Design a protein around this ligand. Structure first.
Ligand SMILES: CN[C@@H]1[C@@H](O)[C@@H](O[C@@H]2[C@@H](O)[C@H](O[C@H]3O[C@H](CN)CC[C@H]3N)[C@@H](N)C[C@H]2N)OC[C@]1(C)O
Ligand SMILES: CN[C@@H]1[C@@H](O)[C@@H](O[C@@H]2[C@@H](O)[C@H](O[C@H]3O[C@H](CN)CC[C@H]3N)[C@@H](N)C[C@H]2N)OC[C@]1(C)O
Ligand SMILES: [Mg+2]
Ligand SMILES: [Mg+2]
Ligand SMILES: [Mg+2]
Ligand SMILES: [Mg+2]
Ligand SMILES: [Mg+2]
Ligand SMILES: [Mg+2]
Ligand SMILES: [Mg+2]
Ligand SMILES: [Mg+2]
Ligand SMILES: [Mg+2]
Ligand SMILES: [Mg+2]
Ligand SMILES: [Mg+2]
Ligand SMILES: [Mg+2]
Ligand SMILES: [Mg+2]
Ligand SMILES: [Mg+2]
Ligand SMILES: [Mg+2]
Ligand SMILES: [Mg+2]
Ligand SMILES: [Mg+2]
Ligand SMILES: [Mg+2]
Ligand SMILES: [Mg+2]
Ligand SMILES: [Mg+2]
Ligand SMILES: [Mg+2]
Ligand SMILES: [Mg+2]
Ligand SMILES: [Mg+2]
Ligand SMILES: [Mg+2]
Ligand SMILES: [Mg+2]
Ligand SMILES: [Mg+2]
Ligand SMILES: [Mg+2]
Ligand SMILES: [Mg+2]
Ligand SMILES: [Mg+2]
Ligand SMILES: [Mg+2]
Ligand SMILES: [Mg+2]
Ligand SMILES: [Mg+2]
Ligand SMILES: [Mg+2]
Ligand SMILES: [Mg+2]
Ligand SMILES: [Mg+2]
Ligand SMILES: [Mg+2]
Ligand SMILES: [Mg+2]
Ligand SMILES: [Mg+2]
Ligand SMILES: [Mg+2]
Ligand SMILES: [Mg+2]
Ligand SMILES: [Mg+2]
Ligand SMILES: [Mg+2]
Ligand SMILES: [Mg+2]
Ligand SMILES: [Mg+2]
Ligand SMILES: [Mg+2]
Ligand SMILES: [Mg+2]
Ligand SMILES: [Mg+2]
Ligand SMILES: [Mg+2]
Ligand SMILES: [Mg+2]
Ligand SMILES: [Mg+2]
Ligand SMILES: [Mg+2]
Ligand SMILES: [Mg+2]
Ligand SMILES: [Mg+2]
Ligand SMILES: [Mg+2]
Ligand SMILES: [Mg+2]
Ligand SMILES: [Mg+2]
Ligand SMILES: [Mg+2]
Ligand SMILES: [Mg+2]
Ligand SMILES: [Mg+2]
Ligand SMILES: [Mg+2]
Lengths: 99, 203, 51, 148, 193, 58
RNA sequence: UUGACAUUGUGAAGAGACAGUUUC
RNA sequence: GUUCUUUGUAAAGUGCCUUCGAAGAGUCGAGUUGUUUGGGAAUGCAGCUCUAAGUGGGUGGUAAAUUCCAUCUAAAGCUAA
RNA sequence: UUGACCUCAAAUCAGGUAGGAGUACCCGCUGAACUUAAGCAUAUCAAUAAGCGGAGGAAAAGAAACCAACCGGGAUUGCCUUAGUAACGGCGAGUGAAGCGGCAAAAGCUCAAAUUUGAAAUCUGGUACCUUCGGUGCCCGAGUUGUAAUUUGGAGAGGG
């Protein structure tokens, strides 16, 4: 990424003529893959919501995406999981009973 | 393939359905002997990905373990010695509940070898496991090139040495800076750094 | 784990042998060392490569 | 070797050299660094003043060699050139033909100023420099090129 | 237990250390034991070289980045650029490492050349008959050493733009120091005029 | 994989299967695929016509 | 010994808040 | 070393365009307790509680929100010196 | 009336297998106190002794959810180093690693998840014959709640 040829500073490093190799197929280890997208969403409408999942949606419907995230952050491990688990309900609640 | 479905279906445990199964099944598992012979895997999706194969010479065993902590089994809680080691009741037990399960069925069918195990169920008192054993002397296995490594003697009772998965976990065998102590194996890695090396011409 | 071998400096070793070689001339030392050389042609004794 | 040892001269002498009153006993001091701030205090202050307490920032997971920057001054700097090709360059101080001294190739991270090179111009390829170092260089007609 | 003027020592023998003493009396014994077992591979291994061909590689960190030594294996990218399959190049006594990556043309070039030079210097015995008896070479890395690419020429023109090379070092450091704060002063700037 | 490709036409699902999970997503999957399905009594009856001891799908 | 979570399911009546999903 | 049979309408590697690419869950992760570690707002381990995702996930040795970058693919397996 | 299927049993049923010994070295569990700190509780001794389970000629570890921050490196183990250092510690007594580098040995990999679906292609046993660490015909049985081939991320698969 265009190093500067000097020892210190911002972009510093040895000038060398770069290459940019192949991508690796363990990079994409998390990707969509149509059958999973299908089998997962197929299981959702088999299974439905679990007691902590419903409770979460009645919170967004009442108390908003904030108290939702916080109580989710308590329910799962982290703030990032709570984020996209709440968002997962945003897109449940919009399509399901709001559309 | 129906397997993938089963995998993502068992991943919803508190889903309104599997709770029904978990509840009814946990009643039945508790109604048989603590160690009883599983006719088939109740998770043929998971078992097969741990190395179960449908053929002759694979066994599934179901085994119950009591849950919770390990009480230091001292009489009247009496430690005798300095107060750090005085603790009776908050004590953890470094080996997994699944580790004890594999061992107790391993001690049950000794002729077998223990391939692996998985959690099927639990409640309060007992955690319920299913162990997959491979018969090392059965010719469909012996002649099987993928699984015949198990018939070697160095794989005897691998669950009592912590060479199953639940062992290679609790033993903390893993790469990288979080594992420095237990990596190459703890007492091993220890003994070395506490070895004094002395050369012929002294360094 | 008693110390058995002893380390010597390479150059010191070589200095030693060097001084030891130079004494294979210098007849008196060879004589004073045992070695009945009072009658041999010369020091040092050099001999045909045919040996 | 035990024959030069003084415990041989002390054979017959009853107290071994250790005194009749004061004996030689197990640990009159305690063991090792015991008594550091109490009975052995007069030693540890002087001798090792500063041995006690805390001083500075903690560094977690410090690795040396982030910090590897071996130093060379203009004190030598020409010693980098092999002795033979060296004399060719001393006489024949010139631009357009100037010795190229790669200091990082020599194992050096920064060039310092201990001072007095000859007036030969020298092209010095370095990682870092002292200001005064690099000044003495240009004062003699050389230049410094930074590298990585 | 503290006396005269001496360094404090931390001499660590407070466990049962006499149990864990390891003396090498077999230093010589094992040198032989492993010299036989080398030369007894050189037989059982047939005319094969006794080692595998290794890549040129730039050493890590800032201390050793200046240098280069043999890496583990040859990067599928180079194995294909030298024009053979990996799975075959395994059996030619080339070592191929599938983890290594090429960010460097100059190293990738260097390594392909090193690869063809080996294909040229080797004779591959055919599947069945013949075997034109070949007198094994004991190394590969000795046949195919690694020397440090030359970074420069002997002498060259003094070219002085007078930018002090130091002043450069200071600013390059400052530029990194107040950088995120000059972006905060382009953002606190962005919203109000 | 025959229902997911719709190449299946008439699909049968037993009312046995003690590890029920094996067969349960099928009424869903078939409905999702517009494939007529039916739940037949016994997994052994499915086996006889298919020459197994049991099948649970035909 | 006391409390909380878990083992822990299904109703009814009286309340608790943006019609009933939910809590004493 | 030789020599016999020819395994074949069998098996294998290579270039291009196109379409894809399934990758392990009471796990990972979190709280807590105990223990252990040089690992220090917590190194591993285990116990109970909570319990994920799929452009996701782990790590990046100071807790946290945010925007980036780097690096690997866990929770299944074997293997001589 | 019969014949299945699932589950569970019984046989001195057919044939195999486990135990115990040893335990210097090895994989785990459990686990002290003496002692040091001139007292002593955290700490130290020591993740040691003792007790317990499990192996092999080696065990283990291992083809990265690695290390790094470089111009990057590239499974594991070992020696020399890192280093009595970063760090931990009534920051007391004490403790205490890792990354790079040189070196020894080198070696790589394979499953689950895929419809063979124009054909369960897979397998133990029994029996008979035989060129007997096995081959063949036939017969029971395993097995679709999935045995072969195929693919394992470095990839790879379906097409043209
Ligand atoms: C337990 N492993 C040790 C490893 O830690 C290391 O031990 C060093 C030892 O070699 C050092 O010593 C070495 O270096 C000294 C100069 N720095 C000179 C003497 C030399 N033997 C000690 N000063 C410190 C230990 N941690 O090197 C030897 C070893 C066996 O690999
Ligand atoms: C006991 N007095 C000694 C004095 O005899 C002498 O001791 C050295 C000693 O330091 C060396 O000891 C050390 O030397 C190397 C140091 N890295 C390797 C490790 C160790 N053997 C000895 N090999 C030779 C003595 N004459 O120099 C140091 C001293 C303390 O003055
Ligand atoms: Mg790149
Ligand atoms: Mg992709
Ligand atoms: Mg069976
Ligand atoms: Mg208990
Ligand atoms: Mg005790
Ligand atoms: Mg304690
Ligand atoms: Mg691992
Ligand atoms: Mg440690
Ligand atoms: Mg050792
Ligand atoms: Mg070491
Ligand atoms: Mg020591
Ligand atoms: Mg002496
Ligand atoms: Mg004398
Ligand atoms: Mg005297
Ligand atoms: Mg006297
Ligand atoms: Mg006397
Ligand atoms: Mg005296
Ligand atoms: Mg006396
Ligand atoms: Mg007195
Ligand atoms: Mg005295
Ligand atoms: Mg005092
Ligand atoms: Mg510093
Ligand atoms: Mg400094
Ligand atoms: Mg250079
Ligand atoms: Mg050098
Ligand atoms: Mg000290
Ligand atoms: Mg002992
Ligand atoms: Mg070798
Ligand atoms: Mg300049
Ligand atoms: Mg900074
Ligand atoms: Mg600032
Ligand atoms: Mg192929
Ligand atoms: Mg291919
Ligand atoms: Mg995985
Ligand atoms: Mg909290
Ligand atoms: Mg809590
Ligand atoms: Mg313990
Ligand atoms: Mg990512
Ligand atoms: Mg990432
Ligand atoms: Mg990389
Ligand atoms: Mg692995
Ligand atoms: Mg292994
Ligand atoms: Mg009877
Ligand atoms: Mg019998
Ligand atoms: Mg025994
Ligand atoms: Mg003692
Ligand atoms: Mg004491
Ligand atoms: Mg005392
Ligand atoms: Mg006392
Ligand atoms: Mg013992
Ligand atoms: Mg060996
Ligand atoms: Mg092994
Ligand atoms: Mg490595
Ligand atoms: Mg190593
Ligand atoms: Mg050695
Ligand atoms: Mg030392
Ligand atoms: Mg004190
Ligand atoms: Mg310690
Ligand atoms: Mg298959
Ligand atoms: Mg891989």
């Amino acid at each position: 990424t265009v190093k500067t040829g000097i020892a210190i500073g911002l972009n510093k490093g040895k000038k060398v003529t770069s290459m940019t190799p192949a991508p690796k197929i363990s990079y994409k280890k998390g990707a969509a893959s149509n059958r999973t997208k299908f089998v997962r969403s197929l299981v959702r409408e088999i299974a439905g919501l679990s007691p902590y999942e419903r409770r979460l949606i009645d919170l967004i419907r009442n108390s908003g995406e904030k108290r939702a995230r916080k109580v989710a952050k308590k329910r799962l491990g982290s703030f990032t999981r709570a984020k996209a688990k709440v968002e997962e309900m945003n897109n449940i609640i919009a399509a399901s009973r709001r559309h | 393939g129906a397997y993938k479905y089963l995998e993502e279906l068992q991943r919803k445990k508190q889903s309104d359905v599997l709770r029904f199964l978990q509840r009814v099944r946990v009643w039945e598992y508790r109604q048989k002997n603590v160690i009883h012979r599983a006719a088939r895997p109740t998770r043929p999706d998971k078992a097969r990905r741990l190395g179960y194969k449908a053929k002759q010479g694979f066994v599934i065993y179901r085994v119950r373990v009591r849950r919770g902590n390990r009480k230091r089994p001292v009489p009247k809680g009496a430690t005798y010695g300095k107060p750090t080691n005085q603790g009776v009741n908050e004590l953890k037990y470094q080996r997994s509940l699944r580790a004890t399960a594999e061992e107790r069925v391993g001690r049950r069918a000794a002729n077998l070898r223990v391939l692996n195990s998985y959690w099927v169920n639990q409640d309060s008192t007992y955690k319920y496991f299913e162990v997959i054993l491979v018969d090392p002397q059965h010719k469909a296995i012996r002649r099987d090139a993928r699984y015949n490594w198990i018939c070697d003697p160095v794989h005897k009772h691998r669950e009592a040495r912590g060479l199953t998965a639940t062992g290679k976990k609790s033993r903390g065998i893993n790469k990288g800076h979080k594992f420095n102590n237990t990596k190459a194996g703890r007492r091993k890695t220890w003994k070395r750094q506490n070895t004094l090396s002395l050369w012929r011409y002294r360094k | 784990w008693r110390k058995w071998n002893v380390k010597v400096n390479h150059n010191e070793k070589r200095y030693a042998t060097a001084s030891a070689i130079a004494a294979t001339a210098v007849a008196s030392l060879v004589l004073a060392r045992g070695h009945r050389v009072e009658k041999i042609p010369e020091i040092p004794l050099v001999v045909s490569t045919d040996l | 070797p035990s024959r030069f040892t003084k415990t041989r001269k002390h054979r017959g002498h009853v107290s071994a050299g250790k005194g009749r009153i004061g004996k030689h006993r197990k640990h009159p001091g305690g063991r090792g660094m015991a008594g550091g701030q109490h009975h052995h205090r007069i030693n540890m202050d002087k001798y090792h003043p500063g041995y006690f307490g805390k001083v500075g920032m903690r560094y977690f997971h410090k690795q040396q060699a982030h910090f590897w920057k071996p130093v060379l001054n203009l004190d030598k700097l020409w010693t980098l050139i092999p002795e033979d090709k060296r004399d060719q360059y001393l006489k024949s101080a010139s631009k357009e033909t100037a010795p190229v001294i790669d200091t990082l190739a020599a194992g050096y991270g920064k060039i310092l100023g201990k001072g007095r090179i000859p007036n030969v111009p020298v092209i010095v390829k370095a990682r870092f420099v002292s200001k005064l170092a690099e000044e003495k260089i240009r004062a003699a007609g050389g230049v410094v090129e930074l590298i990585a | 237990a503290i006396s005269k003027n001496l360094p404090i020592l931390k001499n660590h023998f407070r466990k049962h250390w006499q149990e864990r003493v390891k003396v090498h009396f077999d230093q010589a014994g094992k040198k032989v034991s492993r010299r036989n077992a080398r030369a007894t591979r050189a037989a059982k291994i047939a005319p094969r070289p006794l080692d595998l061909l290794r890549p040129v590689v730039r050493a890590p960190t800032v201390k050793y980045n200046r240098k280069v030594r043999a890496g583990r294996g040859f990067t599928l990218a180079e194995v294909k650029a030298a024009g053979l399959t990996a799975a075959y190049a395994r059996t030619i006594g080339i070592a191929v490492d599938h983890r290594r990556q090429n960010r460097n043309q100059e190293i990738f070039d260097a390594n392909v050349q090193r690869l063809k030079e080996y294909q040229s210097k080797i004779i591959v015995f055919p599947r069945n008959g013949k075997a034109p008896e070949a007198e094994q070479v004991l190394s590969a890395a000795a046949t195919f050493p690694i020397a440090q690419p030359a970074t420069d020429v002997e002498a060259r023109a003094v070219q002085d733009n007078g930018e002090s090379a130091f002043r450069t070092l200071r600013l390059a450091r400052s530029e990194k120091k107040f950088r995120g704060i000059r972006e905060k002063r382009a953002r606190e700037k962005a919203e109000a005029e | 994989a025959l229902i997911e490709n719709k190449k299946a036409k008439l699909v049968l699902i037993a009312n046995d299967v003690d590890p029920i999970e094996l067969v349960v997503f099928l009424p869903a999957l078939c409905k999702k695929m517009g494939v007529p399905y039916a739940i037949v009594k016994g997994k052994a009856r499915l086996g006889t016509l298919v020459n197994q001891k049991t099948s649970a799908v035909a």
